[model samples]
Target: RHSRRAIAAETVEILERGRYTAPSGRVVPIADHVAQAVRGTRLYRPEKLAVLLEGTRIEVTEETTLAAARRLTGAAGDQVACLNFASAEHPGGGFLSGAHAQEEGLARSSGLYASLRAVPQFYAFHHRQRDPLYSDHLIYSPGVPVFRDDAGRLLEEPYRVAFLTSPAPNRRAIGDLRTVEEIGRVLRGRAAKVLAAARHHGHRRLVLGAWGCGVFGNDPAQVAETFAGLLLDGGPFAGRFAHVVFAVWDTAPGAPRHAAFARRF
Candidate 1:
């Protein structure tokens, strides 16, 4: 099975030990050998995923979770479930609900929150301080994601979860970004944290969703653009993910978020 793993490695090592300076500074195109491995081993490539940029894809649909999760099963490499969440630290409270409440959504986060649950707390912020680190605007928690049926049985493939915080308060909230400029700020922070999580967990294949677009109410089109921009300009995180899925829900006709995302990125 993993014999191909050895073959891929040995092949790379052979070329590296005696080949030209190459793309990304490897001896040969890693993708070329990776392609060879794919031809020889177990690899999953979903139809919808193939249309995306070589390393990125976005799905704006009603069933973003199941489709994203289903695409992960039998995949070629180790995967991580990266979704957007707040730092309020609650099992099912805060601006986390709606599709985020779906089984593949906060249901998964809830499991992690349950394991790390505690008495309630607050995350108040006045404005973006010159240094937002003091602002409690973000937190990254690493844990194995638990997936279950309503019956509470474990699912087949386990996903690892990493949450990124976006500030929107409790009880009721706004669905709009506080300002257009804030879009870049919050999303950029998310892009940075996303990379941090991937490196920290030593995992790739980021299955992401539109952060703060839900109950927090960031405009979908702006949200879409913000993420596309972050992912595009995102330091090493730009190309770090083997593949990234936007995991958006279905939109009305010609929705800005849906169209702008697919068009720009």
Candidate 2:
């Protein structure tokens, strides 16, 4: 096996070799498509897509609503979803009766329990109590909301795919770049590589989505910069992708940061 240093060196070499300038005049250090599902289809709405980077805890707030946040960020039609952490235990308390004196303590305890249950955990428990309720929408909680398409059908299959970099702080440091910068580089490289690979393999229609950004403090400007660079580079797959998106999730409690990225081949 290669030594740690050797492995690092090899990885860096790959990155450097992959680096190239696009027709739009931006530099991309690495490019390769991880997923090749939606290559040439317009399934993404850049302007309508929203990205949420959760720092810690699964706290959903109206002030920081997913839809509103995306609008504020000025994300194109491509949108990214949120990442949340939860648990299976009843940390807060159990459900209670609706009585006054007899239910006082139980109600308070139940509320607390509900709050704690909202937080995501690697393994979930007490699932029955955590079921989604219509009223839950009025007050933000820690669970994912289900959505239906125009046909009133649940979208079970993703329409796009993307290859992206993890935004973990340690990974960022080792990669020698910031969240947005790294993502941009990878996107530029992957876009070209994916298009070429697909064409060579004889395929059609592809969609891409990049998720997870809060982990390392990815900013919109850096993301835009990466895209701009790709446009300038005029690489092999410069304008071949059908859609691109980004997402973020909360890994830490209260802090709600940490992110990952994805794309289609």
| TM-scores, all models, native as reference | 0.54, 0.25
Report the error of model 1 at residue 244, Å. Answer: 0.7
C-alpha displacement of 25 in model 1, angstroms? Answer: 52
Tens-digit lDDT track for model 1 on 7-123? 223333433343223223433223333233223221112221222222354444444544564466446546455554453444333212332233224433223333222212322
Estimate, for each residue in 1-265, the C-alpha lDDT of model 2 and write its tens digit: 1232332233234333643333345553322320111122111111111111010011222222222223322434342222111112322112222221111221121121222223333113224444211000011121112111222232232121121111112233234433545555554443333334333333222222222133223343444344335433573345544322222323346423222221111
lDDT (C-alpha, whole model) for all candidates = 0.43, 0.27
Task: Please give the distance, in angstroms, between residue 91's alpha carbon in candidate 1 and its true position after superposition.
Answer: 3.6
Residue 141 in candidate 1 has what lDDT? 42
Cα lDDT of candidate 1 equals 0.43
lDDT for 181 in candidate 1 is 71
